[PDB]
Write a protein that holds these residues in place. Structure first.
Motif, PDB file in Angstrom:
ATOM      1  N   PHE H 110      20.680  47.532 -26.145  1.00 46.90           N
ATOM      2  CA  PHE H 110      19.475  46.851 -25.694  1.00 46.90           C
ATOM      3  C   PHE H 110      19.568  46.536 -24.201  1.00 46.90           C
ATOM      4  N   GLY H 113      16.805  42.524 -20.363  1.00 45.80           N
ATOM      5  CA  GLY H 113      15.530  41.836 -20.376  1.00 45.80           C
ATOM      6  C   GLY H 113      14.718  42.121 -21.623  1.00 45.80           C
ATOM      7  N   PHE H 114      15.399  42.462 -22.714  1.00 43.28           N
ATOM      8  CA  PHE H 114      14.738  42.826 -23.959  1.00 43.28           C
ATOM      9  C   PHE H 114      14.788  41.667 -24.946  1.00 43.28           C
ATOM     10  N   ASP H 115      13.629  41.319 -25.499  1.00 40.30           N
ATOM     11  CA  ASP H 115      13.511  40.298 -26.531  1.00 40.30           C
ATOM     12  C   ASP H 115      12.876  40.910 -27.771  1.00 40.30           C
ATOM     13  N   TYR H 116      13.391  40.534 -28.939  1.00 41.50           N
ATOM     14  CA  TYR H 116      12.927  41.099 -30.197  1.00 41.50           C
ATOM     15  C   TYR H 116      13.089  40.058 -31.295  1.00 41.50           C
ATOM     16  N   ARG H 150       9.075  48.187 -30.177  1.00 38.93           N
ATOM     17  CA  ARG H 150       9.130  47.153 -29.149  1.00 38.93           C
ATOM     18  C   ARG H 150       9.848  47.634 -27.892  1.00 38.93           C
ATOM     19  N   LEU H 151      10.829  48.529 -28.037  1.00 35.36           N
ATOM     20  CA  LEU H 151      11.459  49.130 -26.865  1.00 35.36           C
ATOM     21  C   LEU H 151      10.509  50.084 -26.152  1.00 35.36           C
ATOM     22  N   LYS H 153       7.233  49.591 -26.189  1.00 40.69           N
ATOM     23  CA  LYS H 153       6.289  48.675 -25.563  1.00 40.69           C
ATOM     24  C   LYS H 153       6.901  47.909 -24.399  1.00 40.69           C
ATOM     25  N   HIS H 154       8.229  47.912 -24.273  1.00 43.56           N
ATOM     26  CA  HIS H 154       8.888  47.177 -23.199  1.00 43.56           C
ATOM     27  C   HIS H 154       8.843  47.947 -21.882  1.00 43.56           C
ATOM     28  N   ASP H 155       9.465  49.127 -21.842  1.00 38.71           N
ATOM     29  CA  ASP H 155       9.560  49.906 -20.611  1.00 38.71           C
ATOM     30  C   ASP H 155       8.908  51.276 -20.732  1.00 38.71           C
ATOM     31  N   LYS H 156       9.197  52.019 -21.812  1.00 32.96           N
ATOM     32  CA  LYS H 156       8.717  53.393 -22.060  1.00 32.96           C
ATOM     33  C   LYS H 156       9.107  54.360 -20.944  1.00 32.96           C
TER      34      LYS H 156
END
Ligand code: MG
Lengths: 55, 119, 63, 62, 62, 76, 126, 189
Positions: H110, H113-116, H150-151, H153-156
């Motif tokens: 992860f 800066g990743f939140d899940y 969600r990953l 949607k985070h950076d792609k």
RNA sequence: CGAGAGGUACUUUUCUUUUCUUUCUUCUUCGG
């Protein structure tokens, strides 16, 4: 095609010949291949009276 | 808002009473008579549960009481269900055999207010 | 249309029972519904009114 | 055809408690239970037919 | 056959109800019915094995 | 020129394909290249620096059109 | 340096077995503080029965001479984790890289712990 | 999973473009970096397979098979991000080395800066650290709230190497562990 | 060049908490 030095070896030095995935067994529903393997293993290993053997 | 007032459907026979159906109604009035437990279970389910006399377990008991007081009028029993008995009694009861519990409602305060007077 | 055809290939082509049908035939009968004729079935579906709930078990007696 | 249709659904919900016996008797190191709880390949309906019993066998053709 | 004498007939073997390509498969009633149908029909005709004890009188395409 | 204000990916993939065919046919690049030989790497830098003389004739379904510019549009 | 020290004694195990080959969520009520505790302890490596007592320290450091990131080697179950939820009869929520803790007690005993801080977990079975 | 096939003798034919105008718009609209969102349901197109899914389930539900420093530094060679704190200083009075939990190994994939958050399996990720998980599935599989969606949607922009690093590291861990099917699994007793 | 045959090719593609009830035989409430 893996080399012989990279296979997971048995304590007797016996490397496997063909490695198959465990995931093919619950989907295809094939029991009896493991039974054939366990029967053919018990046939081929020596007993430390070979008659009256389940062949 | 108020509740309903119409009871169960009456049961009319196709013949006359042979003075044995009255015997059967008198003997089967002893069984399936849960009139003594509805007003008890309502009084405990209003003490243990907040928003008292407005929850669903109070409305089913209020319907079963109106169905059970008509058991002398029409031949429809009450049929008190399981998972509705409290199995725990508040402080303002004389049941000293059940595993009781201290009541936090106004009834426990009114029960303690007389013990504060008889001291 | 691709998102419907991908659900059309990956569907069960076998019926569940003799009364119901396959999920593929159920999609085919819904998509090809403008045939304007066939089998003279004409199935309807009636509902119940709101004032029938004023009686004890009023919906069951009304139905 | 209707009495079989109301009995297939009456067997398939009573078999949900028969299929719930693979978690009591099976261990946590079982490979079929791991591959079924992970969702990679297979489910408990394949493990019941593998170990305990096949169950209901019916066809939709007369 | 041994305890009840009410049959008056008996079979030679239960495995002789299958074909010559199906009665040689080990544990055939243990596998799935769709998986033995592949081995007894398609995989038995494509498996490379013995060809002939006389390849001089045979001029077949392959 | 009052339709979308944003350059679509379908027009971008054609503008870059035209610029790569132009640079591959020995055309002078309007942007200063610093150690690069692929025409697509020059075309993406020319698109990101807004130094390309192309105009987009965005046709309308009624029959008219709206002639746009590359420097007027923005790329994300 | 240590902001919490108490003498715990266990009362319940969640699998309640010997060779389950899993983690065991213990339930330990403490003396003279009335504090409840949940903790996932590896029983197969560090054995814990039901009835024995053990001490528990919770220090943010280990070298006991400042230097927030010679050491404390008087314990046998030194762990490390982070406190991510102080949502309160207060209760803490510390995760030691996957093993969850729940230190629920009075609101006056646990008040110096901040949010999203790194703290250890020292334990010794007397 | 996009191709809807398997390694079964199933052939796969390709088309080689000749002009540069077809080559420029091929990796701009048709390539895998552009087909990240599944157009049928809005979710992610690519997900975990079977070996990676099983090795990601087993590294999270065990919580008792600890790794040492030499195994963690070997498994970190396939991970994109750096090493976490060990979080196990002493698990035994005879423990002479700090150990590593299983959920810290999966947390190296992860970003920081990743939140899940998945409330059905008690999955809580904060500051790039898998903090809690307790007996749940469908957060690693294809779903509406999986961590791959969600990953994406985070950076792609850097997820195609995260999935590759996960498929490498989980295949190394499952080779270190070993998955097999024996007669004891069929006997169920 | 058309016809006839056999063959590769859809593989589980949707079961849901695995913790759901038997410790039972128990005061109807008000006023004369
Ligand atoms: Mg295939």
């Amino acid at each position: 095609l893996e080399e012989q030095q990279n296979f997971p070896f048995t304590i007797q030095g016996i490397v496997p010949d063909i490695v198959i995935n465990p995931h093919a067994f619950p989907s295809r529903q094939t029991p009896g291949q493991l039974l054939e393997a366990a029967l053919s293993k018990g046939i081929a290993c020596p007993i430390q009276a070979y008659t009256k053997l389940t062949r | 808002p108020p509740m309903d007032y119409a009871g169960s459907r009456p049961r009319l026979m196709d013949h006359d009473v042979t003075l044995e159906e009255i015997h059967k109604f008198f003997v089967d009035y002893m069984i399936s008579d849960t009139l003594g437990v509805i007003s008890t279970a309502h009084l405990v389910h209003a003490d243990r549960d907040p928003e008292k006399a407005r929850s669903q377990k109070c409305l089913e008991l209020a319907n079963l009481h109106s169905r059970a007081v008509d058991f002398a009028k029409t031949g429809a029993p009450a049929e008190m269900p399981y998972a509705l008995k409290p199995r725990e009694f508040p402080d303002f009861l004389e049941r000293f055999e059940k595993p009781t519990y201290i009541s936090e409602s106004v009834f426990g305060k009114l029960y303690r207010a007389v013990k504060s007077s008889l001291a | 249309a691709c998102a419907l055809s991908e659900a059309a290939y990956s569907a069960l082509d076998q019926p569940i029972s003799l009364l119901e049908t396959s999920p593929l035939l159920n999609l085919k009968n819904v998509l090809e519904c403008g045939s304007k004729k066939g089998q003279r079935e004409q199935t309807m579906s009636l509902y119940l009114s709101e004032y029938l709930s004023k009686k004890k078990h009023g919906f069951e007696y009304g139905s | 055809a209707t009495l079989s249709e109301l009995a297939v659904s009456a067997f398939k919900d009573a078999y949900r408690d028969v299929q719930a016996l693979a978690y009591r008797y099976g261990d946590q190191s079982n490979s079929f239970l791991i591959m079924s709880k992970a969702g990679s390949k297979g489910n408990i309906g394949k493990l019941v037919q593998h170990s305990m019993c096949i169950g209901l066998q019916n066809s939709a053709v007369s | 056959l041994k305890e009840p004498k009410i049959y008056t007939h008996c079979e030679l073997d239960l495995s002789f109800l299958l074909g010559v390509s199906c009665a040689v498969v080990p544990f055939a009633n243990h596998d799935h019915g769709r998986r033995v149908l592949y081995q007894s029909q398609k995989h038995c005709q494509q498996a490379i094995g013995f060809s002939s004890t006389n390849p001089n009188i045979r001029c077949d395409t392959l | 020129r009052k339709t979308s204000k944003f350059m679509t990916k379908y027009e971008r993939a054609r503008i870059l394909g035209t610029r790569a065919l132009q640079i591959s046919m020995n055309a002078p690049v309007m942007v200063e290249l610093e150690g690069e030989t692929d025409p697509l790497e020059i075309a993406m830098k020319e698109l990101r620096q807004r130094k390309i003389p192309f105009t987009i004739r965005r046709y309308l379904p009624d029959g008219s059109f709206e002639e746009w510019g590359v420097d007027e549009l923005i790329v994300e | 340096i240590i902001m919490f020290e108490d003498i715990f004694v266990v009362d319940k195990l969640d699998p309640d077995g010997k060779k389950f080959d899993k983690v065991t969520r213990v339930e330990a009520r403490s003396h003279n503080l009335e504090m409840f505790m949940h903790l996932d302890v590896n029983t197969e490596v560090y054995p814990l029965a039901v009835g024995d007592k053990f001490t528990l320290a919770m220090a943010p450091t280990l070298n006991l001479d400042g230097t927030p990131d010679t050491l404390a080697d008087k314990y046998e179950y030194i762990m490390h984790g982070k406190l991510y939820k102080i949502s309160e009869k207060a209760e803490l929520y510390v995760s030691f890289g996957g093993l969850l803790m729940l230190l629920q007690g009075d609101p006056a005993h646990i008040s110096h712990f901040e949010l999203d801080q790194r703290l250890f977990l020292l334990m010794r079975k007397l | 999973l996009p191709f809807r096939g398997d390694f079964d003798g199933d052939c796969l034919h390709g088309y080689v473009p000749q002009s540069i105008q077809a080559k420029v718009e091929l990796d701009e609209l048709v390539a895998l970096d552009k087909q990240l969102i599944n157009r049928q349901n809005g979710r992610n197109l690519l997900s975990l397979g079977q070996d990676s899914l099983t090795a990601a389930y087993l590294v999270n539900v065990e919580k008792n098979c600890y790794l040492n420093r030499a195994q963690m530094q070997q498994l970190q060679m396939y991970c994109p991000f750096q090493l976490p704190p060990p979080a196990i200083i002493k698990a035994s009075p005879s423990s002479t080395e700090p150990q590593w939990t299983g959920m810290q190994l999966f947390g190296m994939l992860f970003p920081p800066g990743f939140d899940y958050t998945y409330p059905l399996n008690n999955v809580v990720v904060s500051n790039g650290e898998l903090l809690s998980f307790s007996e749940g599935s469908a957060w690693l599989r294809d779903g509406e709230g999986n961590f791959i969606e969600r990953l994406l949607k985070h950076d792609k922009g850097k997820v195609l190497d995260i999935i590759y690093s996960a498929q490498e590291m989980l295949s190394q861990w499952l080779l270190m562990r070993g998955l097999s099917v024996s007669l004891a699994d069929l006997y169920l007793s």
